Write a protein that binds this ligand. Structure first.
Ligand SMILES: Nc1ncnc2c1ncn2[C@@H]1O[C@H](COP(=O)(O)OP(=O)(O)O)[C@@H](O)[C@H]1O
Ligand SMILES: Nc1ncnc2c1ncn2[C@@H]1O[C@H](COP(=O)(O)OP(=O)(O)O)[C@@H](O)[C@H]1O
Lengths: 364, 69, 285, 88
C-alpha cells in the first residue's frame, strides 16, 4: 500500500477523467464520417421501364431514367415511391417513406396522452362494443377469420356533445398502442375547390402507410351531411368530399387493418350512403350519463382531487341532473378552484356542493 | 358460405321476410351475427344471435310523429 | 331502526330460540321493508343475515324458501343483500350432509339466482358442490348443462384467472360426456383471458391430461407428442426420479408412433440432445 | 409583439374588483403554482371577460402584461372574422 493509496495518486483522473478526450475523439470521428458524405437528390419513381432502368422524377426538377444500387429491394420500388438519388451518378440510392402532408403530420403527431380505460365512467356496454369492433380485429384476427366474417371497417359514436366520444376513442387508441389520426371534420373543408377531398386522400394514404392506424374523424356531420341537388358551391364541394371519403373507406381499394372511429352530435343528418353498412358497420349511442353513470363519472374524476374527511357522490348525482361528462369534470375542477378561495389544501363536501351549484347555473 | 354452420337456421325464412335491404345489409347481418357469436363465445351461430343481428341491422325505427301517417 | 334492530338482536334471538316462526317473520319483514325503502347500509345486512341464520338454525327449508322467494318477488332489494343471502345459503348447504335437503336447497339456489351478482363465484362454488352431487348421482348430460348455465363469459366479476377454472371443469365432465368440441371452443375463446392458463400451478397436469386423453380418442399424435414433451420439461415433474422415468417412458411411447412433417423435425432436432433421458436407456435406444 | 405595455394599474381606473380578479386569475396562480400542485390540481388556463364595445378590455390586458412583466401576444375577433381559412 506504499504507492497504492487509492490508485497511484494519478490514474484516477488519467484513466477515465482525462479519457473524456477519447469521447471527444469519437465525436471527431462522427464528424469525419459525416464529412465524407455528399447528400442525395430526392424524387418519385414514375415507371419500371425494365428490370434495371427506372424513370425517376426529381422533385421540382427534371425527370431521368436511372438505375438502382446493386443491393436493393427492387420489388419495393413501386411507382410513386419517394426515392433518393446520388447527386453525381444519379442512381437509386435508397427508398424513402412517402411524403406526409403537413396537415396530416400535425394531425398525426398529437400525443393521445396515454389515457387509460378506467377514466371513462359508466359506458360499460358501449365501450365493450367499441372494444370489440375496433380492438378485436387488431388483437386476434384469426378469431374473426375462423368465425367466418370480415373484420369490421369501423363504427360511429353519436351523442350529445361532451359525452366522451373523443375520450372513448382516445382510450381505444391508447389501449391499442397504435397509430392514431385524430381529426375533426370541420377542419378539413377548404376554400380551394379540390383540397378537402385531397386531404381526405392524404389522410387515408397515411393510414394505409402506417398500419395499424385509427382514423378518428370527429364531427362527421360536417362532411357526411347528406347529398342534395340544391347546387350551392360549398355544399356541393361537401358532396364531393363525402364521395371521396366513401371511396377511401369502402371503395375499390379494400382496406386492411385500416378501424375508423367517427363521432357526431347529429346522427340523423348523415348521408344514407355513409350510413349504409360496410362503411360504418355499427352505430354506438354514447348518450347522456345515467344516475349510476353519473356517479361513476364523478368518482373517476374525483381521484386526483385531495379529499378531507367526507365526500359523497349521490348528493351531487341527484342534484346535478342533466349534466354530461365534461360538466362533471368541471364540477370537480371548480371545486378545486373553490378550495383556494377559502385557502384550503383539500376539499370539503360543501365545497363540492357549491361547485356543482355554480356549474349548474352556468349550465342554465 | 365461408361462415360456420348455422345449425338449422331458417335462412330461407330470413330471406322470405319482405324487407328492402341491400346486399350491403345482408353482409352486415351476417357479420353482426358473427360478432354476436364471438361475444357470446359460441362459434356456431343459431337463430338467437342471428335474430338479434337481424333486428340490429335493419332498425328503421320510425320515431315518427303519427300525424304524418 | 338500526337501534330497534340492534336492541332487538338480543330480544329477537332469545325469541328465536323458541322457534315461533310467524310473528318474528312478520316483524323482520316490516323492518326489512322500511330499510329497503330508506336504503340503509348495515341494518339491512344484519336483518337479512339474521333471518337466514334463524331459518337455518331452526331447521326449516320451506321458511327460508319463503324468505328467498319473498325478497326475490319483493322489490327494491340491495343486491349485496341477495348476494350475502345466497352465499350464506351456500355455506349453509355445503357443510350439511343430507342428500334430499341438499338437493332441494340447490334447486332453490338455482331458481332464485336469475340476475347473477358479483358473488356468482361463491355461487360457482355451490354449483361445483352440485357438480359433485351429479357425479355421485349419475346425471351426466344435464350435469354439464347445469354447470354451464352458470356461464363464465357473461361472468365478468374480476378476471377469470385460475379461480373460475370451471371452463376446465366443463371440459372434464364433458370428457365424461366425450364432447371435445366444447373444450376446443372454450380454449379458442380464452383469448380474452390470456392464451395460456396461469403458469406455475397444479392444474397444468389436469388440463394437459384432459387434452392428451381427448387426443388419444381422436387419434392425433403430433400435438400430443409436443404436449408430452412439455410434460417432461417442467421442473414440477422433476421432483422424484420415479415420476420422471415413468412419465418419460410414456412420452417416448407417445412419440414413436407419429407420422412425419417438418415441424416435428424441428421438435425432434431440438429435443434429441436432451440430457435427462439417459437414466432410462431402453427408450433412448 | 410588444413587451413593455407601460401600465402601472394607475392608468386603468374603476375596475378595482375587476383588476383584483385579474391578478388572482392569472398572476396569483402563476407565482403560487406550487401551492396549486400541493392541491393536486391544474391552474386556470384562460379568462372570459365581457363588456360594452368601448369598455377598455384591451388596456386592462396591457396592464396585466405590464405588472406580470411578461411578453404580450394579441388577437382580435373582428380581425379573425375575415381572412377566411387560416385563423387557427
Ligand atoms: N364518461 C365520460 N363521459 C363524457 N365525458 C367524460 C367522461 N369522462 C371524462 N369526460 C370528460 O370529457 C372531456 C373530453 O371531451 P369528450 O366529452 O370526451 O368529447 P365529446 O364532446 O366528443 O364527447 C374530458 O375533459 C373529460 O374530462
Ligand atoms: N376604464 C377605462 N380606462 C381606460 N380606457 C378605457 C376604459 N374603458 C374603456 N376604455 C377604452 O376602450 C377601448 C377598448 O375597447 P374594447 O372593449 O377592447 O374593444 P373590443 O371589444 O372590440 O376589443 C380602449 O381604447 C380604451 O381606451
Amino acid at each position: 500500500l506504499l504507492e497504492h493509496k487509492e490508485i497511484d495518486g494519478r490514474l484516477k483522473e488519467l484513466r477515465e477523467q482525462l479519457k473524456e478526450l477519447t469521447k471527444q475523439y469519437e465525436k471527431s470521428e462522427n464528424d469525419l464520417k459525416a464529412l465524407q458524405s455528399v447528400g442525395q437528390i430526392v424524387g418519385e419513381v414514375l415507371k419500371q421501364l425494365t428490370e434495371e432502368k427506372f424513370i425517376v422524377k426529381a422533385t421540382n426538377g427534371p425527370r431521368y431514367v436511372v438505375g438502382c444500387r446493386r443491393q436493393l429491394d427492387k420489388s419495393k420500388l413501386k411507382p410513386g415511391t419517394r426515392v433518393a438519388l446520388d447527386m453525381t451518378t444519379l442512381t437509386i440510392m435508397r427508398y424513402l417513406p412517402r411524403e406526409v402532408d403537413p396537415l396530416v403530420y400535425n394531425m398525426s403527431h398529437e400525443d393521445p396522452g396515454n389515457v387509460s380505460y378506467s377514466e371513462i365512467g359508466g359506458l360499460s356496454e358501449q365501450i365493450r362494443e367499441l372494444r370489440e369492433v375496433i380492438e378485436l380485429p387488431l388483437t386476434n384476427p384469426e378469431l374473426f377469420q375462423r368465425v367466418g366474417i370480415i373484420p369490421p371497417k369501423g363504427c360511429l359514436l353519436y351523442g350529445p356533445p361532451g359525452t366522451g366520444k373523443t375520450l372513448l376513442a382516445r382510450a381505444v387508441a391508447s389501449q391499442l398502442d397504435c397509430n392514431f389520426l385524430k381529426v375533426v371534420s370541420s377542419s378539413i373543408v377548404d376554400k380551394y375547390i379540390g383540397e378537402s377531398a385531397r386531404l381526405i386522400r392524404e389522410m387515408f394514404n397515411y393510414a394505409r402507410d402506417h398500419q395499424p392506424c385509427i382514423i378518428f374523424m370527429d364531427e362527421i356531420d360536417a362532411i357526411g351531411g347528406r347529398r342534395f341537388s340544391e347546387g350551392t358551391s360549398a355544399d356541393r364541394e361537401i358532396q364531393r368530399t363525402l364521395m371521396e371519403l366513401l371511396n377511401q373507406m369502402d371503395g375499390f381499394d379494400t382496406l386492411h387493418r385500416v378501424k375508423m372511429i367517427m363521432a357526431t352530435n347529429r346522427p340523423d343528418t348523415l348521408d344514407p350512403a355513409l350510413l349504409r353498412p360496410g362503411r360504418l358497420d355499427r352505430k354506438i349511442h354514447i348518450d347522456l350519463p345515467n344516475e349510476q353513470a353519473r356517479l361513476d363519472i364523478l368518482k373517476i374524476h374525483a381521484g386526483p382531487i385531495t379529499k378531507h374527511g367526507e365526500i359523497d357522490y349521490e348528493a351531487i348525482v341527484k342534484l346535478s341532473d342533466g349534466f354530461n361528462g365534461a360538466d362533471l369534470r368541471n364540477v370537480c375542477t371548480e371545486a378545486g378552484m373553490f378550495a383556494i378561495r377559502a385557502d384550503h389544501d383539500f376539499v370539503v363536501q360543501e365545497d363540492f356542493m357549491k361547485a356543482v351549484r355554480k356549474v349548474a347555473d352556468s349550465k342554465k | 358460405s365461408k361462415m360456420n354452420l348455422s345449425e338449422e337456421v331458417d335462412l330461407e325464412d330470413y330471406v322470405a321476410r319482405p324487407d328492402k335491404i341491400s346486399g350491403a345489409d345482408i353482409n352486415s347481418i351476417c357479420q353482426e351475427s358473427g360478432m354476436l357469436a364471438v361475444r357470446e363465445n359460441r362459434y356456431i351461430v343459431l337463430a338467437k344471435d342471428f335474430e338479434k343481428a337481424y333486428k340490429t341491422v335493419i332498425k328503421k325505427d320510425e320515431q315518427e310523429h303519427e300525424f304524418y301517417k | 331502526y338500526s337501534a330497534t334492530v340492534d336492541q332487538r338482536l338480543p330480544e329477537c334471538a332469545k325469541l328465536a330460540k323458541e322457534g315461533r316462526l310467524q310473528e318474528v317473520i312478520e316483524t323482520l319483514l316490516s323492518l326489512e321493508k322500511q330499510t329497503r325503502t330508506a336504503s340503509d347500509m348495515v341494518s339491512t345486512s344484519r336483518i337479512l343475515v339474521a333471518v337466514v341464520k334463524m331459518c337455518y338454525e331452526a331447521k326449516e327449508w320451506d321458511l327460508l324458501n319463503e324468505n328467498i322467494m319473498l325478497l326475490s318477488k319483493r322489490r327494491s332489494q340491495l343486491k349485496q343483500a341477495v348476494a350475502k343471502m345466497v352465499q350464506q345459503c351456500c355455506t349453509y348447504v355445503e357443510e350439511i350432509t343430507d342428500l334430499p335437503i341438499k338437493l332441494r336447497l340447490i334447486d332453490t339456489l338455482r331458481m332464485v339466482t336469475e340476475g347473477k351478482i358479483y358473488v356468482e363465484i361463491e355461487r360457482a362454488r355451490l354449483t361445483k358442490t352440485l357438480a359433485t352431487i351429479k357425479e355421485q348421482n349419475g346425471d351426466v348430460k344435464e350435469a354439464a348443462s347445469i354447470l354451464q348455465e352458470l356461464q363464465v363469459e357473461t361472468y365478468g366479476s374480476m378476471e377469470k384467472k385460475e379461480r373460475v377454472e370451471f371452463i376446465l371443469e366443463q371440459m372434464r365432465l364433458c370428457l365424461a360426456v366425450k364432447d371435445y368440441i366444447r373444450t376446443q371452443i372454450i380454449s379458442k375463446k380464452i383469448n380474452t383471458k390470456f392464451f395460456q392458463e396461469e403458469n406455475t400451478e397444479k392444474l397444468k397436469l389436469k388440463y394437459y391430461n384432459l387434452m392428451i386423453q381427448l387426443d388419444q380418442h381422436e387419434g392425433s399424435y403430433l400435438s400430443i407428442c409436443k404436449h408430452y414433451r412439455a410434460i417432461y420439461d417442467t421442473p414440477c415433474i422433476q421432483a422424484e426420479s420415479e415420476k420422471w422415468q415413468q412419465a418419460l417412458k410414456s412420452v417416448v411411447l407417445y412419440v414413436i408412433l407419429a407420422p412425419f412433417d417438418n415441424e416435428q423435425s424441428d421438435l425432434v432436432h431440438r429435443i434429441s440432445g436432451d440430457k435427462k433421458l439417459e437414466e432410462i436407456p431402453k427408450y433412448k435406444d | 409583439v410588444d413587451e413593455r405595455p407601460t401600465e402601472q394599474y394607475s392608468d386603468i381606473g374603476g375596475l378595482d374588483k375587476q383588476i383584483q380578479e385579474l391578478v388572482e386569475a392569472i398572476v396569483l396562480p402563476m407565482n403560487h403554482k406550487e401551492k396549486f400542485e400541493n392541491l393536486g390540481i391544474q391552474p386556470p388556463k384562460g379568462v372570459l371577460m365581457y363588456g360594452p364595445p368601448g369598455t377598455g378590455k384591451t388596456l386592462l390586458a396591457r396592464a396585466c402584461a405590464a405588472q406580470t412583466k411578461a411578453t404580450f401576444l394579441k388577437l382580435a375577433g373582428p380581425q379573425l372574422v375575415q381572412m377566411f381559412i387560416g385563423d387557427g
